[PDB]
Design a protein around this ligand. Sequence first.
Ligand code: 8JD
Ligand code: OAA
Ligand code: OAA
Ligand code: NA
Ligand code: NA
Ligand code: NA
Lengths: 439, 435
Amino acid sequence: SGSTAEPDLKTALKAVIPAKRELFKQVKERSDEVIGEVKVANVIGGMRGLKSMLWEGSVLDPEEGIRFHGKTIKDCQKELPKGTSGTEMLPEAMFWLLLTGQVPSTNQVRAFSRELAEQSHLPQHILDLIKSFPRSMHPMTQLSIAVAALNTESKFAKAYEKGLSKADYWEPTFDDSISLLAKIPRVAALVFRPDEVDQVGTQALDASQDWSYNFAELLGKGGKENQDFHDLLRLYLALHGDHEGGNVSAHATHLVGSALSDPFLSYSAGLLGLAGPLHGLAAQEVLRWILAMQDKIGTKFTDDDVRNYLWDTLKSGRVVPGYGHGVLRKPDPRFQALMDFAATRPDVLANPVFQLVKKNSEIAPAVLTEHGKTKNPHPNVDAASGVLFYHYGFQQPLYYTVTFGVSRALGPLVQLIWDRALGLPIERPKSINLLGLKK
Amino acid sequence: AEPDLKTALKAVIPAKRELFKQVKERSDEVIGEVKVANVIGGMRGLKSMLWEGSVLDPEEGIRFHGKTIKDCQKELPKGTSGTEMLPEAMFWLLLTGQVPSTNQVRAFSRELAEQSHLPQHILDLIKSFPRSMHPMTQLSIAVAALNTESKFAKAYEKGLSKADYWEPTFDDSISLLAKIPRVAALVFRPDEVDQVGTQALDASQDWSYNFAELLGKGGKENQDFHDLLRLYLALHGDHEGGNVSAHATHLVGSALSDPFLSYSAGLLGLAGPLHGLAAQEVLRWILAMQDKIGTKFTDDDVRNYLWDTLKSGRVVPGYGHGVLRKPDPRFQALMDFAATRPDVLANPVFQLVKKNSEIAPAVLTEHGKTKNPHPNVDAASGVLFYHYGFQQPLYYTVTFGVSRALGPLVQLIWDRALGLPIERPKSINLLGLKK
Ligand SMILES: CCSCCNC(=O)CCNC(=O)[C@H](O)C(C)(C)COP(=O)(O)OP(=O)(O)OC[C@H]1O[C@@H](n2cnc3c(N)ncnc32)[C@H](O)[C@@H]1O
Ligand SMILES: O=C([O-])CC(=O)C(=O)O
Ligand SMILES: O=C([O-])CC(=O)C(=O)O
Ligand code: NA
Ligand code: NA
Ligand code: NA
C-alpha cells in the first residue's frame, strides 16, 4: 500500500537543484561585474578579506557570527529536530538544512539517522590499515589517512573511471558524502580505541538512534549514565559543522574536490588542514593552557590572579588560546551556545576548570584589548569546547581535534555536492612573486 | 667543499626578507579587481597568492626565476651519464634562485640517497593496502604517514621561534624528497615491499637514476629511460602557485601542518581527473581509441572519437589549461625528447598521440567551450612511460607525485622563512552575489 513517508534526503535535494541552477545562471550573466579590489595585502596576507569563493550553506558575518541559510544558531536550536532523548539539535538535521535549505521534519531526520547507522560498516582492509598504525602516530594523521583510504569505496571515483557525464556528477558525490558521514564516527572511534579495533570496527549501531548517540557508543560512552554527554556531542557536532567556505578545512575540501577528486580524498585534505596547529588544534591547546593556569593559581582564585596570568602570557609573546579569529570581530555565537549548555547543569557550573574558563572569558577580552596586539579580543568556540568534554570524562585532549574532524565533514561535503550539481570548475587562481609586486 | 644547500638557502634568506618588507610597505596598493566571474569560476585570473620560484605566463609558459625550460636544460647540471637536466638541480635553483655547480649537485644527490630509508611502520602500512586501492590513494596515504618522522611537527609542539620555522621545514622537505621515490616504487611493486623497501640506493647516482633502480629499471641498459625520467621529473616539479597540488600544499601548510601532511594534501589534489590524474586518463583514452579505430585508421576515425567523447559529456584529457592559452613548453620538451629517438617515433601508441595532437585542437575549437585548444604536458608524458615498459596507466600519476614534491616544498620553506599567514579567503553565497 501507499507510503506515508515524507521525501528522503536525496529526493528533497532533487527538488531544489533546478532553482539553484537557475539562480546560478542569473548570477553568471553578471560575470563581468566588478565587486571589489585586490590589494598587495590580499596576496601576501593569505587572501584575508578577499571575497573569492562560493559557499552556499553558511556565511560568516564578522560582526554577527555564523548564519546557516540566514538562520542563527539559536534559530537552529529551536527549529531543528532533536533525538529520541535529550534536548540538543541533531547534527544530521543540521546537514539536512545545510544541503536543502530547509528544516526537516523529525520523521525525515529519523529516517536519515537510520541510513547513517546502516551505512557505517567498514571493509576489512580499513581495519587492517588502522591496525598498522604505530601507537604514537598522531590521531589526526590516523584520521586523515583512514578517510582517504575509504576512497576504495568511492562510487564517484569508480563511475568517473568508467566514463561519467558531467551532468551526472552530483548523485555519486551525494552517495559518497552520505557514505563518509556514516563511516567517519566509527573511524574516529577506531583512532580513539586502538586496542578494540575488531569490536568497534564491526559493532552494529542502533538504527533507531542518532548519529551522535551512536558515535558516543563507539567511543565507549554509551548508556543512560552518559545522556548529558550525548547532548553535548550533538550540540558540538552541529555547531562545528560549517563556518563558511574560506576556513582551511572547508576550502581544502573544495579545492581538492574541484579537480574531481572524490569526497573521501577531498575531505582527507580538509582533515590534513584540521591537523594544523593554526586550524584544528586550538581546542586542545586551550584546555592545556587552562589546566596549566589552574595548577598555578589554584581552584580558589581572584580576578587579579587571572589578570596577572594573562599579562604574563602576553608579556611572554604568546597568544591567549581560544581568543580572536581570522574573520570574527565580535563574540562567537558558537561560544555562547556552549556556555549556555553549561548554564542548566549545576555539576558543570561547580567544576573549577569550567569556572576558570568562565572567569577568563570575563577578564581576558579587556586585557587583550589593553595589550593592543589582537584585532579580536573575544572568545571563539575553541575557548569552551575542551572543558566541556573534559568535565564529562573525555579527558585526552589529543582527540578533541578528531571529534572536530567528524563534525567538519558536514558542511564541506554539502558544498561538494553543490559544486558538482552546479558544475563549478577547478579552483585555479593566479600566483605572483614578490619581484612582480615590487615592479 | 662548496656551500651545501641549507647554507646556500641561509645566504639568500636575508635579501628575501628585505624584499618582503618593501612589498609590505605597499600593502594598500590596488593591483586588480574582483569580478563575479572570479568567485563563481574557481578564482580564474585572480592574482591572489605568492609563489617565488616560478611564474606561469599564459602565452609563453612556465619560467623558473625568469628562466625558460630551454635555459634550464642548458644551464642546470647533468648526471654522471646522460644529457638531461637533473631534477635535484632544478630544486636547488627553485629554492635559492641560483644555479648550483655540478659539485654542489653531486653532494646533494648523495644526501638524497642517504636519507631515503623508511621506518618499518610505513612498509607495514603499504602491505595493508588492498589490490583494488588506486595507486594515488596509496601514495597520498604513505606520504601523510611519514609525518611520524616530522621534525617540524615535533619542534613546533616543543617550542620553536617563528624566525626559525623554516629550518625544520627544510629538513622535513629534504627527508620527504629523499623518501618519496622509494614510497612510489613500493606502490608500483606491491609484491616486493620488504626488498624494495630496504634496498640500498647507489650513493654515487642521481635521484632519478635511483628512482629508476627502485622501479626495476636500473643499469646501463636503461640509460635512455634514466634521461627521460630526469627530464620528466624536472619539467613537472613546479608550475607556479595556483595549480591544485601546489595550492593545496600551501593551504594546508599555512595552518602549520608539516610538509608530510601538507604535500599529502597536494597529492590528493593531484589525484584529481582534472589535475595530475589527467596523465593516467590520457593514455587510457588513447588506448581505448586505438582499440576502437584499429591499427590502420583515418583522420576521420580520430576526429570521430574526439567528438564522441565530447558529446558524451566527458573531457578530452591532456588538452586545455587554466592559464596557458598557447602550446605548453613542457609538452614541446617531451615531444623534442621523442624526436631524436627513432624507436619512440615508430611506437604506434606514440604515433596515435602525435596524430591526435594534430586533430584535437581543431575539434576543441569547433566545440567552442575551451579557452585553450592546445595540448598540455599530460598529452605526452604517459606514452613515453608506456614506451619504456610502464604499461599500467593507473600508476602514471604516481611519477607526477614524485616530481611535484619539488616546487611546493620549496614554497613551504619560503612560506615559513617569510612568516606568511594562514590562507583564509572570504566566501559568499549566490544570493549575496545577486544583490
Ligand atoms: C599537468 C596536469 S594539468 C592536467 C589538465 N587536465 C586535463 O588535461 C583534463 C582536461 N582539461 C580540462 O578539463 C581543462 O582544460 C582544465 C585543464 C581543467 C582547465 O580548466 P578551466 O580553466 O576551467 O578550463 P576552460 O577552458 O576555461 O573551461 C571552459 C569550458 O571548456 C571546457 N573544457 C576545457 N578543456 C576541455 C577539454 N580538454 N575537453 C573538453 N572540455 C574542456 C571546460 O570543462 C569548461 O566547461
Ligand atoms: O572560520 C575559520 O576561519 C576557522 C574555523 O574553522 C572555525 O572558526 O570553525
Ligand atoms: O598549472 C596548472 O594549473 C596545472 C598544471 O599544468 C600543473 O600543475 O602542472
Ligand atoms: Na592480518
Ligand atoms: Na562557444
Ligand atoms: Na568559445
